[PDB]
């Protein structure tokens, strides 16, 4: 007898930084999702999340040491005994990812890497951590930052936002013209962000007035995470849950009834508003499930300047699919083509281009003619290439595969073999050997430089 393979999971990120500090002896609330913000039914208690990852910044404990007390915290939680999927640390920057023992075979690919932000003196003690796995069919990454701090650094945040999304190296190496934005079914990407609520440092004491009435709309609006999203600065494409708790940092230690804002030589005689420093954000594939359930901080938690924040998910996910021909060969009965495609391109550069599609569904990539470059009427450029896109071969036709994969696509000059612009299609349709309306923009480090659309028609044995 086997148990069915899930087509959901539910997903745990915790977010803490710890000010160098050891936890508390009881760190349940975290995992509960409760205090502050959008929370967890009481009932749920006992069910045990999925996977469990958890995010550290300025953690002072051993790996050894920190394991033993999440994992001792979810047992009582939950009385199962989870297995670690992989920890990984830089400085003081720490991930871990826990899952319950019916998954340990169906995790697999396990990866982890760092970056490292500054320049020589910048250099030293921010950056990133991540992981990533398979969970049967579907690809799983996630990334926990500590980006520069101070109000007056929101570029530099920005920046090593950029840094990390090029340089860590995660999932599939086949994915080669693809970042961590594009090469995860499901991305999550949390921390210790840094990026403050931008108000005249006179204003504390209001900001704290407001915090006590929980009223945080005049402060969210002057967030510089939010409004650097707004204006496409940083994070494109990513989403975040409202928020509804109040700043998480900086707090005095050992209680949370003050807000500690003002400059010391210990801070580098810098005032410290009160923020919404420590974040969860988020990145799907176009059309599949994933819905947050909590987003909140713990109010029990003081041995930190900061409270922990935790966010929950249910996340679709798929089985690792086999047929009588692929993988392995090809299923003649699948198919899928593309008409009347154009990429609209920001470049100033006028060289050839051509496409790269990448895709799980494909025994390997596939790489198309050259397009026709035109100019557009608002002097862009425009690539055209018509019908003349191959003909895709999947691996697999059973719809209940095919319509739940994605194509990723790639731009890439002929000159150079460089990409300059990334992107993905869902093939969940509305109707299969039906002409449909595609799009998805186009990336490049993460900015914008373009669009994708045409049309595409899908074929499966049914
Ligand atoms: C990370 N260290 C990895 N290197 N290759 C990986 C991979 C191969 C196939 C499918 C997914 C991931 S993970």
């Known amino acids: 007898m086997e148990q069915p393979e899930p087509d959901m999971i539910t997903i745990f990120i915790g977010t803490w930084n710890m000010g160098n500090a050891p936890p508390p002896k009881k760190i349940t609330s975290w995992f509960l999702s409760k205090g502050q913000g959008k929370t967890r039914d009481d009932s749920a208690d006992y069910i045990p999340h999925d996977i469990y990852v958890i995010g550290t910044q300025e953690d002072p404990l051993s790996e050894k040491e920190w394991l033993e007390i999440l994992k001792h915290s979810l047992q009582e939680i939950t009385s199962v005994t989870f297995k670690t999927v992989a920890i990984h640390t830089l400085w003081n920057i720490r991930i871990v990812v826990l899952a319950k023992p019916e998954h340990e075979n169906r995790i697999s690919h396990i990866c982890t890497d760092n970056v490292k932000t500054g320049i020589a003196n910048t250099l030293g003690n921010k950056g990133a951590v991540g992981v990533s796995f398979m969970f049967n069919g579907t690809s799983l990454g996630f990334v926990n930052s500590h980006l520069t701090s101070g109000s007056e650094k929101k570029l530099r945040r920005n920046q090593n936002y950029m840094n990390i999304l090029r340089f860590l190296a995660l999932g599939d190496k086949k994915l080669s013209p693809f970042n961590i934005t594009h090469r995860f079914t499901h991305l999550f990407w949390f921390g210790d962000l840094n990026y403050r609520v931008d108000l005249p440092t006179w204003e ?17 609006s002057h967030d510089q995470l939010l409004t650097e999203r707004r204006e496409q600065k940083v994070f494109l494409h990513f989403e ?3 928020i509804t708790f109040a700043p998480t940092y900086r707090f005095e230690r050992l209680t949370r009834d003050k ?7 210990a801070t580098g005689m810098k005032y410290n508003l009160p923020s919404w420093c420590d974040r969860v954000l988020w990145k799907s594939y176009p059309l599949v499930h994933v819905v947050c359930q909590s987003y909140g901080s713990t109010s029990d938690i003081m041995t930190s300047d900061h409270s922990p924040v935790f966010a929950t998910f249910e996340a679709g996910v798929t089985s690792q699919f086999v047929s009588k021909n692929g993988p392995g060969t090809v299923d003649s009965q699948g198919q899928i083509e593309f008409l009347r495609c154009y990429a609209t391109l920001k470049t100033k550069s006028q060289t050839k281009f051509y496409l790269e599609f990448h895709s799980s569904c494909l025994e390997s990539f596939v790489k198309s003619q050259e397009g026709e470059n ?12 018509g019908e003349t896109l191959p003909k895709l071969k999947p691996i697999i036709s059973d719809p209940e595969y095919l ?8 731009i890439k000059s002929s000159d150079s073999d460089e990409s300059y612009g990334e992107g993905c299609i869902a093939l969940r349709l509305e109707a299969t050997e039906t002409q449909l309306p595609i799009y998805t923009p186009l990336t490049h480090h993460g900015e914008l430089t373009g669009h994708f659309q ?3 028609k899908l074929q499966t044995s049914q």
């Open 204 to 220: 504390a004491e209001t900001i704290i007035q407001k915090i006590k009435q929980q009223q945080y709309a005049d402060l969210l």
């Open 240 to 242: 975040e849950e409202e």
């Open 454 to 456: 045409g049309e595409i």
């Open 259 to 265: 807000y500690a804002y003002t400059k010391q030589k």
């Open 374 to 385: 035109e100019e557009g009427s608002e002097g862009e450029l425009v690539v055209k290439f």
């Open 403 to 410: 319509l739940d994969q994605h194509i990723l696509i790639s």
